[PDB]
Structure 1
Amino acid sequence: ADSDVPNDILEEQLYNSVVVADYDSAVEKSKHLYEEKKSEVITNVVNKLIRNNKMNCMEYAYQLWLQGSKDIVRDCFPVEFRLIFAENAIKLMYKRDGLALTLSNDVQGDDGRPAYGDGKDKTSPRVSWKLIALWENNKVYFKILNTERNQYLVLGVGTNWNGDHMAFGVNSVDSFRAQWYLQPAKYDNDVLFYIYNREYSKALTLSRTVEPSGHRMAWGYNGRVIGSPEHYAWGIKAF
């Protein structure tokens, strides 16, 4: 009888449940709350996780999605979380510039197609991406597939003077350089995500330098990103 527990208390223990990464328990309490009509408990927990930039939010959503609770992700989480986990075509839009992430037309080096924010285009099939979930080591990571080119996003192994790594599309996952993790954030009314490389733990960002073409190169950033989602974070929209 969850009716007999204050709502504030129900929020807290689900939230604690997620933050300590106890996912069977969070999924179990969630299935029960939803059942008894208490969905706002869940929605409040989700908003708290997003505001506090809680990485465990992603594991939470993904577990809900795998464990027969697609209904919960759909109802208590912003539409982004359904696009991620249903693996729908998305666009990745960099909050600071409003630029859409894409791969270059021309294959440069073994490196594959340099990635960058497109100075103009937010509509062509070049800008469509898929995020493909995997569970390992009690965490959730994603491969980021560019759908037109069928190439995966990665951080090159070399650095520039500042320790930043270029981002490219390549044909092959051999390594953690092709896998990423997400941290949710709230800006204005947006749900935004910091997007981190699994090998280097650096955030995917767009350079401040505009190319002669109007494009800005995509890098893994050597420096602090958190606390600045309008500079470092990505919004996710349906393609």
Structure 2
Amino acid sequence: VPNDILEEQLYNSIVVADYDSAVEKSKHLYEEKKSEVITNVVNKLIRNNKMNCMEYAYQLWLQGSKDIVRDCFPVEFRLIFAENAIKLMYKRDGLALTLSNDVHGNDGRLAFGDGKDKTSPKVSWKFIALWENNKVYFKILNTERNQYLVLGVGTNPNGDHMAFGVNSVDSFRAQWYLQPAKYDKDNLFYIYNREYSKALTLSRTLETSGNRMAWGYNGRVIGSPEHYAWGVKAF
């Protein structure tokens, strides 16, 4: 069976979401010393923005096979599933995600992309994952505040929702799924809110200080990694 067919039979199981199966074929391939099949499948998923590549990294993660994720996927999947201190870097603008100091009403702390601050402990986040409905989701916890990223209910008139940090994961509002993308050679993520299915972005209106408010965005993002997606970087 040429690596042709193997790749496509690994890519298949992944996109119709047969995660159990993709795991097996990936263990075999791996044992059979054909890792380059796995790598290449993965880079193909990430190219084609296949959300299902998060779920295949997660099942490898829980199915004995951590070595496959650290081995054969871009370093981010390790940063994510290993729960490391990371920062969330917006491609468009290059600002790092953070939380305001004071609390905005019952809605929590305001999430923005801070204008100056790229190394302070305030820009530290972890990913914390679950499995529901044959899909992986993340809690996004600011390190300094022990508060989760969340999307508030009220919209502006575009239908955009505001992002804050709250003390609990109460609702589907505080849970996120990711979609991988390339832009050049960087690996990026569109980060959607489970409840509204809107993409985490930074505002186009810019505050005098340099910060941009972060929003759950009501419109298309796909095809514009450089404008929309995020960089996971070790804190």
TM-score, with normalisation over the residues of structure 2? Answer: 0.99
Structure-1 separation of matches of 2:16 and 2:205: 40
CA positional deviation for 1:162: 1.0
SS of residue in 2 equivalent to 1:169: strand
Alignment partners' CA distance in 1, 2:169 and 2:233: 25
The Cα shift of 1:132 comes to: 0.3
Q: How many residues align?
A: 235
Match of 2:77 in 1: 81
CA drift of 1:50 comes to 0.4
**Secondary structure, counterpart of 2:163 in structure 1:** strand
> Any idea what the Cα deviations from partners look like across 1:52-76, whole Å, max 9, x if unmatched?
0001000000000001111110111
Per-residue displacement from partner, 1:136-174 (whole Å, max 9, x unpaired)? 011000010001000001000000111100000011221
Classify the secondary structure of the residue corresponding to 1:158: strand
Distance of 1:16 and 1:111 partners within structure 2: 42
Partner of 1:194: 190
- Asked if residue 22 in structure 1 is aligned to residue 15 in structure 2, the reply is no
Runs of 4+ in 1 over 6 A off after TM superposition: none
Report the alpha carbon displacement of residue 114 of structure 1 after superposing the two structures with TM. 0.3
Secondary structure of the corresponding residue to residue 110 of structure 1: helix
User: 3-state SS of the aligned residue for 1:122?
Assistant: coil
CA distance in 2, matches of 1:88, 1:39: 25
**Which of 181, 184, 189 matches 1:185?**
181
CA distance in 2, matches of 1:58, 1:197: 15
Q: Shift of the alpha carbon at 1:185? A: 0.3
- Alpha-carbon shift at residue 128 of structure 1 (Å): 0.4
Give the alignment's TM-score, normalised by structure 1.
Answer: 0.97
SS at match of 2:87: strand
- For 1:173 and 1:58, locate their aligned partners in 2 and report how far apart those are by CA, in whole Å: 21
Match of 1:222 in 2: 218
Partners of 2:41 and 2:184 lie apart in 1 by 19
Shift of 1:212: 2.0
Residue 188 (structure 1) shift: 1.2
Distance 2:215 2:163 in 1: 5
Q: Distance in 2 between matches of 1:173 and 1:191?
A: 27
Q: Which runs of 5+ in 1 are unaligned?
A: none
Residue 111 (structure 1) shift: 1.2
